[PDB]
Design a protein around this motif. Structure first.
Motif, PDB file in Angstrom:
ATOM      1  N   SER A  13       4.459   6.461  -0.327  1.00 46.56           N
ATOM      2  CA  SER A  13       4.873   6.940  -1.665  1.00 46.56           C
ATOM      3  C   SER A  13       4.117   6.154  -2.743  1.00 46.56           C
ATOM      4  N   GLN A  14       3.555   4.995  -2.387  1.00 47.00           N
ATOM      5  CA  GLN A  14       2.712   4.201  -3.320  1.00 47.00           C
ATOM      6  C   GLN A  14       1.325   4.821  -3.350  1.00 47.00           C
ATOM      7  N   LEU A  29      -4.043   1.454   3.249  1.00 51.82           N
ATOM      8  CA  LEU A  29      -4.799   0.971   2.080  1.00 51.82           C
ATOM      9  C   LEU A  29      -5.032   2.105   1.106  1.00 51.82           C
ATOM     10  N   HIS A  30      -5.298   1.673  -0.136  1.00 48.19           N
ATOM     11  CA  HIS A  30      -5.674   2.577  -1.226  1.00 48.19           C
ATOM     12  C   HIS A  30      -7.087   3.093  -0.979  1.00 48.19           C
ATOM     13  N   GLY A 139      16.668  -3.608   2.687  1.00 56.16           N
ATOM     14  CA  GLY A 139      16.325  -4.495   1.559  1.00 56.16           C
ATOM     15  C   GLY A 139      14.906  -5.023   1.690  1.00 56.16           C
ATOM     16  N   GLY A 140      14.283  -5.367   0.558  1.00 52.91           N
ATOM     17  CA  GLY A 140      12.869  -5.777   0.467  1.00 52.91           C
ATOM     18  C   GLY A 140      12.025  -4.698  -0.190  1.00 52.91           C
ATOM     19  N   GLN A 141      10.713  -4.929  -0.283  1.00 53.11           N
ATOM     20  CA  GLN A 141       9.748  -4.072  -1.027  1.00 53.11           C
ATOM     21  C   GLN A 141       8.922  -3.225  -0.051  1.00 53.11           C
ATOM     22  N   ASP A 142       9.341  -3.116   1.215  1.00 51.38           N
ATOM     23  CA  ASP A 142       8.639  -2.260   2.206  1.00 51.38           C
ATOM     24  C   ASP A 142       8.852  -0.783   1.851  1.00 51.38           C
ATOM     25  N   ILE A 143       7.856   0.037   2.163  1.00 46.54           N
ATOM     26  CA  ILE A 143       7.789   1.468   1.785  1.00 46.54           C
ATOM     27  C   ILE A 143       8.128   2.305   3.019  1.00 46.54           C
ATOM     28  N   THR A 144       9.112   3.198   2.922  1.00 48.91           N
ATOM     29  CA  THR A 144       9.579   4.026   4.068  1.00 48.91           C
ATOM     30  C   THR A 144       9.465   5.518   3.778  1.00 48.91           C
ATOM     31  N   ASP A 145       8.859   5.925   2.658  1.00 49.80           N
ATOM     32  CA  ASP A 145       8.734   7.363   2.324  1.00 49.80           C
ATOM     33  C   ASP A 145       7.257   7.707   2.146  1.00 49.80           C
TER      34      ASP A 145
END
Ligand SMILES: Cn1cc(C(N)=O)c([C@@H]2CCCNC2)n1
Length: 152
Positions: A13-14, A29-30, A139-145
């Motif tokens: 999603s990032q 990666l971007h 919880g935390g800043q990990d991305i799951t979507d």
């Protein structure tokens, strides 16, 4: 009948793309421009399992490869691995449970929960060049979507 499959890419999603990081690891990666050819193309198979409007069991193979994402215990923890199979026998409709993800619709995006390990998800890190992994902490800043892009 056969199993039905779609070619596709995934981005978190990032908006990080997924690339092979050696034979048996994926990293996020971007990516944009020429370097987008490096991204992994999946064959998403629609497999046997518990199903609802918003939750669809799939397997994630690498297109043109006898490799599947796979959820197993490693050193006693649920982990994501790329696992080799006999190319004569895959894909199939009754994939073994370690290969099955529940593809869930979440706020216009997709989440991939392990069928084997409830509430463990395909995850990426915030930072670039880190492995794709199976996360079991909410919880935390990990991305799951993720978003899916359809490929010819
Ligand atoms: C035959 N083949 C299938 C795939 C894939 N499933 O991603 C690949 C990768 C694509 C990215 C560049 N390296 C090779 N090659």
């Amino acid at each position: 009948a056969p199993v039905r499959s779609l070619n596709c890419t995934l981005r978190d999603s990032q908006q990080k793309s997924l690339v092979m990081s050696g034979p048996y690891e994926l990293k996020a990666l971007h990516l944009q421009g020429q370097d987008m050819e490096q991204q992994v193309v999946f064959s998403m198979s629609f497999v046997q399992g518990e199903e609802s409007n918003d939750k669809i069991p799939v397997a994630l193979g690498l297109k043109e490869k006898n490799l599947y994402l796979s959820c197993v215990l490693k050193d006693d923890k649920p982990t994501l691995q790329l696992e080799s199979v006999d190319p004569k026998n895959y894909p199939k409709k009754k994939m073994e449970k370690r290969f099955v993800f529940n593809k869930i619709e979440i706020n216009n995006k997709l989440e991939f929960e392990s069928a084997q390990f409830p509430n463990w998800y395909i995850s990426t890190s915030q930072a670039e060049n880190m492995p794709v992994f199976l996360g079991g902490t909410k919880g935390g800043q990990d991305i799951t979507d993720f978003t899916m892009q359809f490929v010819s």
